[PDB]
Amino acid sequence: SNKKMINGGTVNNWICINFSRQVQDNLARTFCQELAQMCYVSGMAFNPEPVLPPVSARPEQVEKVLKTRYHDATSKLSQGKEIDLLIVILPDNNGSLYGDLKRICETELGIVSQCCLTKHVFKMSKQYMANVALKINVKVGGRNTVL
Ligand SMILES: Nc1ccn([C@@H]2O[C@H](COP(=O)(O)O)[C@@H](O)[C@H]2O)c(=O)n1
């Protein structure tokens, strides 16, 4: 028995920001679609479409891109609704980016985030997707089985 979802959480509103120069917009798009699909079939409610298309940014502009995209996506929502998830694509070797990302999301935006390395985005294996779905589920308030 591999882990499974007991209670699937809900992601009605999500966006993706990409920080990897090896990843074009369409690949980010396709990756997120596969991830959304896995989350759904595993037992989550998960909108197949993001609030806004993926955007690509340089790691040096992490603060600016996050706050701007957060503001723009939120303003697009029905009044009172919030962004449930930010998917972030990172270079395999990203230095301080991961930590900066987390501090901003956790303590400034108050948004749940899931980071995904470029290497995994290119591979898009079903096992990887399943694992990330499990992580996302816990983060949005769902519950998974224990081994
Ligand atoms: N300081 C860190 C810690 C994790 N990561 C990476 O982020 C991923 C998981 O991100 P989450 O914390 O958002 O679940 C992994 O696949 C991992 O190797 C990183 O790139 N730098």
Q: How many residues does the chain have?
A: 147
Q: What is the resolution of this structure in A?
A: 1.8
Residues in contact with ligand 1 (CB, 6 Å cut-off)? 90, 94, 98-99, 113-115, 117, 135
Instruction: Report the alpha-carbon distance of residue 126 to residue 116 in Å, rounded.
Output: 14
Q: Is 49 exposed, middle or buried (0-12, 13-18, 19+ CB in 10 A)?
A: exposed
Instruction: Report the alpha-carbon distance of residue 48 to residue 121 in Å, rounded.
Output: 17
CATH code of the domain covering residue 64? 3.40.50.2300
Instruction: Report the alpha-carbon distance of residue 76 to residue 52 in Å, rounded.
Output: 9
Cα 122 to chain centroid distance, Å, stands at 16
Q: Which residues contact 95 (CB under 8 A, 6 or more apart)?
A: 59
**What's the 115 CA to ligand 1 centre distance in angstroms?**
6
- For 86, the domain range is 1-147
Helix (H) or strand (E) run with residue 78 in it:
none
Sign of CA dihedral 23, 29, 34, 36: positive
From which experimental method does this structure derive? X-ray
**What's the 79 CA to ligand 1 centre distance in angstroms?**
32
Breaks, C-N > 2.5 A, in the chain lie after: none
DSSP-based three-state secondary structure for 1: coil
State the Cα torsion 66-72-77-83 to the nearest 10°: 0
Decide if 18 contacts 115 (C-beta within 8 A).
Answer: no
Instruction: Report the alpha-carbon distance of residue 75 to residue 120 in Å, rounded.
Output: 31
Q: How many domains does the chain have?
A: 1
Instruction: Report the alpha-carbon distance of residue 133 to residue 127 in Å, rounded.
Output: 10
Report the nearest-CA residue for atom 14 of ligand 1: 114
Decide if 124 contacts 31 (C-beta within 8 A).
Answer: yes
